[PDB]
Amino acid sequence: MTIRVAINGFGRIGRNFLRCWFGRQNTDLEVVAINNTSDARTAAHLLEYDSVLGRFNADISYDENSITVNGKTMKIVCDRNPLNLPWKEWDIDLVIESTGVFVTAEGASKHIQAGAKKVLITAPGKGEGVGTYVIGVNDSEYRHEDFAVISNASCTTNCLAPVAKVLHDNFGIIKGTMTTTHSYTLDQRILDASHRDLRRARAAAVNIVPTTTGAAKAVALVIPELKGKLNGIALRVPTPNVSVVDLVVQVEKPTITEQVNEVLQKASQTTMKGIIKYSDLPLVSSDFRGTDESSIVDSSLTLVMDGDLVKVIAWYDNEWGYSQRVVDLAELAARKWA
Amino acid sequence: MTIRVAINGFGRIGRNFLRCWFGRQNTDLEVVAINNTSDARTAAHLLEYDSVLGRFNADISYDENSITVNGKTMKIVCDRNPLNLPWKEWDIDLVIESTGVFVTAEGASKHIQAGAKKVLITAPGKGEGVGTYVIGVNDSEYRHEDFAVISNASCTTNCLAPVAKVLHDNFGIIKGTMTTTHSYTLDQRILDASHRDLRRARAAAVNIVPTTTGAAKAVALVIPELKGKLNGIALRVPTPNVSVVDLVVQVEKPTITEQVNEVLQKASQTTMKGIIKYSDLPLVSSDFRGTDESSIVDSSLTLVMDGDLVKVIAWYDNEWGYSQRVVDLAELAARKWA
Amino acid sequence: MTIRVAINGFGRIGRNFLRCWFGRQNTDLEVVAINNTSDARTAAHLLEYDSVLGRFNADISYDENSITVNGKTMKIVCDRNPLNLPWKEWDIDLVIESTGVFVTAEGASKHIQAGAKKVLITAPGKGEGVGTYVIGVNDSEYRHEDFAVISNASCTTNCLAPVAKVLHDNFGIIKGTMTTTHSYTLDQRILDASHRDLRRARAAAVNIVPTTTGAAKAVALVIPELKGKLNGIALRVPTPNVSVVDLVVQVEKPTITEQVNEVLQKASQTTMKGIIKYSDLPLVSSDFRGTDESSIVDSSLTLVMDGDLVKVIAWYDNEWGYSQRVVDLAELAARKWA
Amino acid sequence: MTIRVAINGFGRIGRNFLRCWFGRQNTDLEVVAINNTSDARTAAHLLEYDSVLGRFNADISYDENSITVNGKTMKIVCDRNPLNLPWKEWDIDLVIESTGVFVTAEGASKHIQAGAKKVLITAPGKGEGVGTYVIGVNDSEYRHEDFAVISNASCTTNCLAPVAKVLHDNFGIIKGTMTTTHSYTLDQRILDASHRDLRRARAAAVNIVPTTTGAAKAVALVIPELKGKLNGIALRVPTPNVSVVDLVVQVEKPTITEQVNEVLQKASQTTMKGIIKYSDLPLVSSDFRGTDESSIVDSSLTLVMDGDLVKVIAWYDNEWGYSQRVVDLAELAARKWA
Amino acid sequence: TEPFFGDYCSENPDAAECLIYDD
Amino acid sequence: EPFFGDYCSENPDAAECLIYDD
Amino acid sequence: TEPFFGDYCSENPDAAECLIYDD
Amino acid sequence: EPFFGDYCSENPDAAECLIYDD
Numbered sequence A, B, C, D: 001m002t003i004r005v006a007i008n009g010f011g012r013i014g015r016n017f018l019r020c021w022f023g024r025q026n027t028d029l030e031v032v033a034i035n036n037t038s039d040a041r042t043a044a045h046l047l048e049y050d051s052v053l054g055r056f057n058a059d060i061s062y063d064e065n066s067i068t069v070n071g072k073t074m075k076i077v078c079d080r081n082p083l084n085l086p087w088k089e090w091d092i093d094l095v096i097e098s099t100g101v102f103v104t105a106e107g108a109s110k111h112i113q114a115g116a117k118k119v120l121i122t123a124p125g126k127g128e129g130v131g132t133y134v135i136g137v138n139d140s141e142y143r144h145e146d147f148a149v150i151s152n153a154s155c156t157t158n159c160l161a162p163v164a165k166v167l168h169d170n171f172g173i174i175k176g177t178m179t180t181t182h183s184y185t186l187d188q189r190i191l192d193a194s195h196r197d198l199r200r201a202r203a204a205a206v207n208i209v210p211t212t213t214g215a216a217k218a219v220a221l222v223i224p225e226l227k228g229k230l231n232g233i234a235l236r237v238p239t240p241n242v243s244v245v246d247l248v249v250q251v252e253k254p255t256i257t258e259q260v261n262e263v264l265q266k267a268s269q270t271t272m273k274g275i276i277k278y279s280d281l282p283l284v285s286s287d288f289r290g291t292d293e294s295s296i297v298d299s300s301l302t303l304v305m306d307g308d309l310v311k312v313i314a315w316y317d318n319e320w321g322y323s324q325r326v327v328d329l330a331e332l333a334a335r336k337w338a
Numbered sequence E, G: 001t002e003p004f005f006g007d008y009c010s011e012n013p014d015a016a017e018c019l020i021y022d023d
Numbered sequence F, H: 001e002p003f004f005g006d007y008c009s010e011n012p013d014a015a016e017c018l019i020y021d022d
């Protein structure tokens, strides 16, 4: 058991990944270190009173150099440079890459050159030589041996993938396209302010901000039979949390909604057990907080065109939803470690 | 020339409309009275003051039964059953139906009855018996004597419209899908309290809200050739205006990306000069306020997959861009008001 | 003894009542039937999924004539007029009047002349002849054979009271005022539409609406001695829940903050043990959700001026910290029935 | 004469000012260079695109390394370090300190070290050695031979001060307090993120977050006669603009509500015309957008409590407005130059 | 000011118009 | 339709049966 | 109690983890 | 990238350099 994990960036998701681990039955991961652009109080009194999660029902202490949830202590490190991070010295199997920054393959390796023995990134992985892997997609196609750097993709895709999957091991997707009408993040300024992206520059809790996304094209990188069959778009909007995808797809075998719906049903019950939720109700976004799935079908809104052309809609907690998906990737690497 | 007009529905398409008419340097109709579940004082205030379109710049005032702008004193009413609206007695050639209730054919007529002559439906029209005309798309065939009961369809249907068309013209459409993100509109609830459509019951402001639409099967009316080819849906996010549309259309005449946007700029000026604004810039919501066009393509977003599967994003100011496609249709009248 | 309870208007105030009571260990009441303007199809729902209170964890199902909440069943009806209400024929000891209209001293007795022993109110008690009680204030003065028409009172007055009371005895108030930044209630339009308070007409999501109140003269009551001493008002704002109160009171007895907060921390183990809470922490609205308390104080923010001027601040869940004084009061009556 | 200026802090306020100038009738200024942490495509943009304000009326052009604006063209330089700045070499006379960071004279020297010859801060003075003005309080004790280190202090205080003025005058403040209700500012965070003030660290759209302010006693610096006599605090709320000061203050020449609310009728049109306004109307934050006055009084609210207790409410547009308290000031130096 | 909001607010006060919560 | 179908047919502009084809 | 934000707020006094606008 | 390619380089955790591929 115990492989030993450190969390880079105590970021949203990164705390979200914590509350997610903790409250789990059991594990082979031990959250043991945690470094932020912050001090330990600041990072302490944030695991607790959280905007969208609510206050943690928990016993949390803090000293000047680490905290303690339920008398189980992990670490506080104030330093940005991932190299200048004590990984062999603290004996570290794995690293949660939730800075939102070191998400490449090179920069990224910077925990490996620090002494951590493997890299797990909370973001699409940009660059060469990385084993981005999607639970209940290729969750099984993972060998500890392969890559030093794996990523658990993006909010969206972890919701988008365990879907397209089904659609294909079934009806056969010819083409596609996508759009996720999505909850606003921190790559947006509260006010129109200077930025790389003139949209992310633009004040967020007031606007509807198309942002290009790759959460689409990258579904090739887990369901190979898909390579460049999907390319999506991202409207961004003053809910702080949660989102849902407008997936459309052509096929070469025809059908209609009921089949479509019911095929997921099974999936929410059989194949994708625990991965996909199913919804025959008139719900709304803040209903889907806390959700331990990655893809909530809402057959309600499912449609179908001329028999062959399809369109689905699933909600996914951008935040907690994902962070689970990671305890689902971290765990793996633990129960196959060497 | 000077045909007499009035408004049941001085609320939103109400003011917008009017502020919009008093905002024409050359105008065919004389709006004379307004019936509104408010008093005069009030209808006065709200024409004047706006949280979206700021203030009105115009000399304004009132007494206990009329409201005065720059000169035109108009008449404020207080009645619910339109039959009991003094139509006849005031030679009201033209009635504005912006209450969002009398959108029944049958609900339309109770203006004729009480004593009016022609009534306009600022929304889709219910059941048999109404001309449904989209400016710059089929307005080609407006003839006074055709139907006396006409609709301007939905904010959204309007968007779908010109684009649908030019799509039909240059590559013509087989079938697609529609996904509008829309801004909250007063039929929702601020926060949760009862409502027959149980999504519409949910707190508009803090909550992605999904609702029915037929505002897309709201095509054929204006396009004979497009009979139930493209069904959409919609989602109601937290901003009080300005909305964008997500099309997705398997075209038959094979095509590529910027050759589509080619046409949008062709048409942007050719046929649609003043219908579609054409937009490569990188913009969000608060950039289409005050905006007159209707369909408003975000070009830098279009996304042809496998040559066939076009995807095009489209803006619009739902309130305002419509409160002109009315005051245009509305003008169309006085020029065949035979 | 169980006194058997009916609920009129399943509002916010009326759905939270149900969740809180329906929650506690030992309860003295028995909820039996609720009068909203809504089928049981819908009430299940708005009780089941609060936009704010997050999923409700419980065995809830509906028929056409009642809602079932984990085992227990209460009948649901659609009657607007109290008098048609089958109360006597349902052995209804106490009803809750919270449609917020029959808030009259009179009309709310239409409930009684519809069968019911005693009727509760959830807003101020306007017009003469009506009981008001601030739980843990005058609550000491409760007399079944005093009124049949009680009142928990404004969401702000129950926050107010357990404050001024406290100061008036320790130091003593000469006079004051207050103001509260306020969660945006259901009585001010989602957008700019007709209304009787020109401000409320205005879209609370997008603005800052100040409005009148009698939440203060209101204190000039259950605290007799504060007679026409404190007034003021409040502003409402785009936070769907939990409001918060800045109190400005003179006194006849000079002090210093560090003690001011000490006496207060006092009434947070004594006379108000469960009425007032306490943050030495640095929080922000969303931090006080699900908070079973009448007045939250931030020690810190607190501030003295010369000794005879006191700025005091109180949080509060407008929706819930109140639906637990109602519950409380309710169960009060239930224990001193007859 | 007609001197040269610099803008150091081309963010929300920076641009505001810029547009503030480019509106005006008459100019004793000419801008020609802004230091920003951006590029010039960027500078152009938020100048001509703006959630709050709205696109600029103008032909607006940029190039690799500067922008032009309807002729009057300004140079664009990117330096976090002020000391490597080209002022002496471009003979910039006055610099606008609107990065909002060099509050202390310390950072205000480094531009003068850099060859510019005076400097106005868009934020409070820090440490000593720094000048301080607000039109109306002491627009008059102005002397060029005093400091080249000056500020309008802050938004908030522009409201407090002009107001506080008459209040000592015709009544003679003994003491008070005040709560400044206030939309948010680019110092917070859209979502829970790290930060030194723990309040300012949590999602700024979905909480009333309290922050600590100097706009308080630090108003004893234009009328020292309020030397630590006010104080008060700050409450932030989900608007992205406009805001209001909840003032209260004891007196020794006492009053009725309409007394002062009549006083403020006088100052409006006289001593304080252009520095204050006077709405009695039913209004909210959105209407006051773009209001040049430093304080705006909603009559309705102004109150008493046994003659001496006085309370008034002052809308400022902390962005736009605060600028026209600046732009103005920039033109008190340019005018009085040597 | 009761040409309206009162002779109408006497009758249908559940309304989008008449709801006063003495908050 | 159980409740709403009718009430809404009788107070049709009432805050609760208000559908704008969006 | 500033065991991190002296140093950081001395190199980056404008990184959002740091700002203060004194309204 | 006449200012960004580096500024973000040398300061990547910059409010104005951050990019979350949602």
Ligand SMILES: NC(=O)c1ccc[n+]([C@@H]2O[C@H](COP(=O)([O-])OP(=O)(O)OC[C@H]3O[C@@H](n4cnc5c(N)ncnc54)[C@H](O)[C@@H]3O)[C@@H](O)[C@H]2O)c1
Pocket: A008, A009, A010, A011, A012, A013, A014, A035, A036, A037, A038, A079, A080, A081, A082, A098, A099, A100, A101, A102, A103, A122, A123, A124, A153, A154, A155, A156, A185, A186, A318, A319, A322, D192, D193, D194, H013, H019, H020, H021, H022
């Ligand atoms: N809701 C979500 O946040 C969400 C959903 C899906 C995917 N993701 C992934 O989440 C990542 C971050 O999202 P987030 O919510 O955590 O935003 P976040 O701001 O909360 O995470 C940023 C954190 O990283 C820290 N950080 C950055 N650079 C650092 C460095 N060099 N050293 C130490 N700490 C550093 C910062 O202090 C900050 O607290 C993104 O890259 C995105 O791909 C996020």
Ligand SMILES: NC(=O)c1ccc[n+]([C@@H]2O[C@H](COP(=O)([O-])OP(=O)(O)OC[C@H]3O[C@@H](n4cnc5c(N)ncnc54)[C@H](O)[C@@H]3O)[C@@H](O)[C@H]2O)c1
Pocket: B008, B009, B010, B011, B012, B013, B014, B035, B036, B037, B038, B079, B080, B081, B098, B099, B100, B101, B103, B122, B123, B124, B153, B154, B155, B156, B185, B186, B317, B318, B319, B322, C192, C193, C194, F013, F020, F021
């Ligand atoms: N973005 C948009 O606003 C948009 C887009 C497309 C269509 N519309 C149309 O707006 C129309 C009306 O809703 P809205 O946008 O005007 O919001 P709204 O509430 O401002 O318009 C409703 C107004 O009508 C008044 N009213 C309702 N019934 C009345 C009656 N029987 N007699 C007198 N007055 C009455 C209401 O009090 C209110 O002032 C809808 O039918 C919808 O189709 C709006």
Ligand SMILES: NC(=O)c1ccc[n+]([C@@H]2O[C@H](COP(=O)([O-])OP(=O)(O)OC[C@H]3O[C@@H](n4cnc5c(N)ncnc54)[C@H](O)[C@@H]3O)[C@@H](O)[C@H]2O)c1
Pocket: B192, B193, B194, C008, C009, C010, C011, C012, C013, C014, C035, C036, C037, C078, C079, C080, C081, C098, C099, C100, C101, C122, C123, C153, C154, C155, C156, C185, C186, C318, C319, C322, E014, E020, E021, E022, E023
């Ligand atoms: N924070 C608060 O919301 C708050 C605080 C203090 C006091 N109050 C008082 O609470 C009372 C209820 O407020 P609320 O939040 O429950 O408003 P609400 O609209 O959310 O709840 C009212 C419910 O009663 C229903 N109803 C309306 N007319 C009816 C009728 N004729 N017969 C039966 N049912 C009817 C409504 O449709 C709604 O579902 C208000 O009077 C308010 O002043 C509220």
Ligand SMILES: NC(=O)c1ccc[n+]([C@@H]2O[C@H](COP(=O)([O-])OP(=O)(O)OC[C@H]3O[C@@H](n4cnc5c(N)ncnc54)[C@H](O)[C@@H]3O)[C@@H](O)[C@H]2O)c1
Pocket: A191, A192, A193, A194, D008, D009, D010, D011, D012, D013, D014, D035, D036, D037, D038, D079, D080, D081, D098, D099, D100, D101, D122, D123, D124, D153, D154, D155, D156, D184, D185, D186, D318, D319, D322, G014, G020, G021, G022, G023
């Ligand atoms: N509420 C208001 O809008 C308001 C009112 C009055 C005063 N102020 C004061 O205005 C100042 C700035 O606030 P703002 O509202 O304009 O936010 P802002 O961040 O948008 O303006 C700051 C701009 O300065 C630039 N900048 C940042 N750091 C820099 C640096 N080191 N060197 C050069 N340029 C840099 C950035 O491009 C940024 O956009 C603060 O001191 C604040 O207290 C704000």
